[PDB]
Amino acid sequence: SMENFQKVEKIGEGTYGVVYKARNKLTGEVVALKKIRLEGVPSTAIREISLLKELNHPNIVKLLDVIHTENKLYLVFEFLHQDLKDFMDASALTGIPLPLIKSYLFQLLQGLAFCHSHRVLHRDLKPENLLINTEGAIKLADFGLARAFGVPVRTYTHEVVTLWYRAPEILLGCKYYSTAVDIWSLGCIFAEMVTRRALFPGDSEIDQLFRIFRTLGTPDEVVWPGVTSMPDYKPSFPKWARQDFSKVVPPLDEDGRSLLSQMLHYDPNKRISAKAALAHPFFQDVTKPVPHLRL
């Protein structure tokens, strides 16, 4: 019931709807409200609600309530501090230390492992959809573009995932894609946190692909069996050599470079799963450092 909530401010717009900051007048709890105005109830909302009600994990945003009225639909979330995009925009150059990055990636992999173990593909992992609190936590948010997948997968919606974070199997138009697409996105985010700029900031599909190829090499049959038969593969693709990861992400240690490499593997089934990534030596000394407080 909307009576108990006092809206504080608008935060922005997600995959769908508009997000507000609000306060429960009775408990004092600060909450995020995701409003949707009512073709009936949107697919995006139906999916987000159903899946987010199933998913209870420390690194997935907590959906507290669904306020279901005649003309308006409100999703009530726990309020944390800030999304990661804003955090990075607010951070000074030296403002995001490696231990925090390592902690954040470890946690994001936990949240994602949980999603995938519960047959959910997120399909829009980017800084804006990741939320941090003041105590060192980070959580997956905005499941509007998510879906429940089957075993084995069917063909699902094409051209999914925000362009900069979109996996090469989506770009090359493969009939099937699955959990590997979210890992690719996280790898791009990992590199972005370290270097403080987007890894592959393409403006179109071909630009996106060519940017990926210049970093990882142009894929051939050896690195990616079946690649030359993929619908949007072109034999005219320029050939670029793969570069050293010491040069792709210079501040990163040997273990970090190893993990990033496995997250950005061309072949989706050779690409590391979130579950397997949790045991990577990169996390041997992982802690939970606290971020700065600047908004």
Added chain:
Amino acid sequence: VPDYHEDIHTYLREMEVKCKPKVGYMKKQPDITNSMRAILVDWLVEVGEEYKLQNETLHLAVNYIDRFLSSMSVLRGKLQLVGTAAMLLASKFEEIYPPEVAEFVYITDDTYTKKQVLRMEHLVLKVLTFDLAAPTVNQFLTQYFLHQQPANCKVESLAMFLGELSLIDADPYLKYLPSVIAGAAFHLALYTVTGQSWPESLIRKTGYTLESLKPCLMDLHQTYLKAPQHAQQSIREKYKNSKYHGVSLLNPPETLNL
């Protein structure tokens, strides 16, 4: 076989129990019957065929309806409205390109208005508490298909056919979990086409033995034998198509030797 196949199977087994409709709800329904439900589900099959919807969407709609009717009394003149709203919701959940609301209004022969469909959608959502990601017979089947030695298209389509037939008849299939119906349908399809039986690898994955599936299997064998004589025929018509390898034209076995 991903790193998550076991986790997902385990999770779907948990959720099928939580998503299970009330076995004896039709007795508590003052106006509708199993026959009326059979007519509805057969009609949903036609709708799925007309709009080329996923079988999964069909299975989801039926789950929503049965759960809705588990707590909500519905007059016979309103059953199709419940069914339409459920198919719409299943379509929004499962389909890349759901048919539009106006298209759902059209195939209800203008019995209902757009506003009615939309209001029924809201009510279904309220009653199901937005919990739409339910396990289905189809979801278990596609997992079981990975255990074929080797893969057989005719077996796959026959299993899906058999599992689809079970949707029509609340008596007796309401008492069986999706994972069990899928096991029965996979064994029955495997037996009809190849002569082989419920495989050891699935026995160990599911914990289900031939014996444990026998009750459901006996019912399904009977539905299969009696299928040509059933009042509702849309599923047999559907599974004649080359898309499903014309498996409904295949002969059911005389005995299962159980």
